[PDB]
Design a protein around this ligand. Structure first.
Ligand code: ATP
Ligand code: ATP
Ligand code: ZN
Ligand code: ZN
Lengths: 401, 399
């Protein structure tokens, strides 16, 4: 039930000591990564988010300006070029503020929702690294919302709604919500922190979401609402987060022209719904015990013959399924049908199609699932249509399940 | 027709001195980036490529083994962690070999085509930086093909076929091909370079490709076929490259079990079709002067109302076009309709849909293009199908 064990079994990824905390995504694991990206992008379109891409490294002087250098130095990778030192970004907020600062912004541009699948690199202590859940290089489903003070309630509510919307796709039953308050090392006045912490609490209360306080776990610039998911050992892992920030836009000279034609500093909301793709995939691997939902499965269908007599038929079906958009593979090895079924069941392939002379002649397929069920024979076109519905709807359950 | 000027006008990207040679991709520019990713992925499924993702940095000992540290040192970004050096990867080849080395490989696994949109970082001299053409951080449509010696001809032929297949989508008329031979500083024996250079020369001639030699411009590990495209002032930019490598797999302990059950070292072919996304987007921007083809346009359709009376009707169409897979925006601002049209025309939006009272009553829409062509009232579903066909076929011209 360990995601590291399942990851090796399904050939999802590997790690080596030439790059501690750095993930080598194999073809099958990268497929899950990219499917989550498509799923997130469908939500970004629905909730009207921009998607951008910031540079990997920026000058150290900018990270000093944000207060990151003083409160985050130990976790930052640095490099140099031409007598100038750069920081590999551990966060995407300063890059998004730089994009916001291009061109004059007015209140008609707010709220401005700017998302990124941003690569973050943090020099986490090597003793704390754990599989995919704690790594040194990860990709956040990050976004930053620039808005007025009057828009805070609506935008924070939208982030909370998005969290439960996207978590419901995976059928999570245990979602623990925490409000992380000010840490010992922080910027911003006590009055600002009181307003920011109260705003997040009111938003949670308004949505009728029970939560507990997590004292001192907030960011150095803003408090956090934390959505916690649990692994196989029931250990708590922070995945969802929404942050209410009154300080960083001022530090980076972000401003917009208000209704009064007076210059105003926008409020910034930081949020990551999945958290990081690496940690969320690890949580998904242990939650499903490798039985990924069909829309997430690296290989959705395996088609396989009894002898050569059905080998040509299998190849035609694999091409037909592939043209229909289904991740399908052919297993034409000289092995017993039970041998093939057991191997691909270990690979957690959702559906295995068995082809004898009976099916070759009838144009049908014998259907078997990774759960050991025998679904019998039904027509190829019916199988295609049901699989497409299961994939497009991102259904959690298989056929007749 | 300078891409830096067009990129500023169209809000595609920006660059700052706090991050020299590093691109801030804005929403509209990142849309073009992602569309090229979709285009490349569609082709790579056709040619049966894996897609992987290597990590950002690896131990400097790795780059010593490949010879990169001796032949590529000054152009590499380096960092530190717990008394160890790490190299920000300037290439994706060592990472792909590491994935190849996971698990036993046999001849039945070859040719193994392993692709990645690999982020590369190179410390290019700051005086050589130029817009999107030459940057310090870029993404290559990279891949490495592990194959046998007998499979070299077919695999290199497939790489060349891929280059002209994907380039024909953009209608490039001038594609200049060069064969770069052994540099001064290189690894591998002379005999291997003789064979590798001859193999690439034979492939170019067999493919009816006229080419010129570029002596000493090959990689320190392999010769390379270079596909050259030209910017607005006809400056030569290397985008496509095919590299034949007989040395790196051995240095990185790559091997497979042959048909004879003997350990054998695979041949590696390095290839990038577009080159880098940053440089190719720059080429496209100057080639089209900001008039991106509809499948590439950041915003394909803008629907505007003349007054408030049609504001609802515009919203329903915007949802209906968006549900059809079209990047569409509604312009309901309190501005004159002529003001709205001019703004989106200057943004090179391919199609602009104007909705008056007669459009609402008839369920139609008035269509005009960024080139000033007026297409009159057209049925809404006729708009969508024609738009879908234009995006589907990746057509160069508006129908
Ligand atoms: N080292 C890491 N490895 C994997 N995911 C991480 C790591 N650090 C942070 N994340 C993810 O990024 C999200 C947002 O980052 P944030 O800065 O809020 O994390 P925090 O340092 O754990 O607090 C987290 O909710 C988590 O899912
Ligand atoms: N500094 C750079 N900026 C942008 N693109 C680059 C840069 N260096 C290389 N490329 C692209 O990467 C491709 C392959 O990289 P290579 O090492 O052969 O040079 C080139 O054909 C070119 O398109
Ligand atoms: Zn942030
Ligand atoms: Zn390479």
């Amino acid at each position: 039930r360990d995601h590291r064990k399942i990851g090796k079994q399904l050939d999802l990824y590997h790690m080596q000591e030439e790059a501690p905390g750095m993930v080598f995504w194999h073809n099958d694991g990268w497929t899950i990564f990219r499917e989550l990206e498509v799923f997130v992008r469908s939500k970004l379109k629905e909730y009207q988010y921009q998607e951008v891409k910031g540079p990997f490294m920026m000058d150290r002087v900018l990270w000093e300006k944000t207060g990151h250098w003083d409160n985050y130095k130990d976790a930052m990778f640095t490099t140099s070029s031409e007598n100038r030192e750069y920081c590999i970004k551990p966060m995407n907020c300063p890059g998004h503020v730089q994009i916001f600062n291009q061109g004059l912004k007015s209140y008609r541009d707010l709220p401005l929702r700017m998302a990124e699948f941003g690569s973050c690199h943090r020099n986490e202590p090597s003793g704390s690294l754990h599989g995919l859940m704690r790594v040194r290089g990860f990709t956040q489903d990050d976004a930053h919302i620039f808005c007025t003070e009057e828009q805070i309630r609506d935008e924070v509510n939208g982030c909370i709604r998005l969290v439960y919307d996207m978590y419901s796709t995976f059928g999570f039953e245990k979602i623990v919500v925490k409000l992380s308050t000010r840490p010992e090392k922080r910027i911003g006045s006590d009055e600002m922190w009181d307003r920011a912490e109260a705003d997040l609490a009111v938003a949670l209360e308004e949505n009728n979401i029970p939560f507990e306080y997590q004292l001192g776990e907030g960011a150095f610039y803003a408090p956090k609402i934390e959505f916690t998911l649990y692994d196989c050992l029931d250990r708590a892992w922070q995945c969802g987060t929404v942050q209410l920030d009154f300080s960083l836009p001022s530090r980076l000279s972000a401003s917009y022209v208000g209704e009064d034609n007076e210059r105003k500093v926008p409020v910034m909301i930081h949020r990551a719904i999945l958290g990081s793709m690496e940690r969320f995939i690890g949580i998904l691997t242990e939650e499903f015990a490798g039985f990924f939902p069909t829309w997430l499965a690296p290989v959705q269908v395996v088609i396989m013959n009894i002898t050569d007599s059905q080998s040509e038929y299998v190849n035609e079906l694999t091409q037909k399924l592939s043209n229909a958009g289904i991740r399908v593979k052919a297993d034409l090895r000289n092995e017993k049908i039970g041998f093939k079924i057991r191997e691909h069941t270990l690979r957690r392939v959702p559906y295995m199609l068995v082809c004898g002379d009976k099916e070759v002649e009838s144009g049908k397929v014998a259907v078997r699932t990774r759960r050991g069920k025998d679904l019998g024979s039904m027509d190829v076109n019916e199988v295609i249509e049901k699989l497409q519905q299961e994939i497009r709807s991102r259904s959690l359950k298989q056929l007749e399940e």
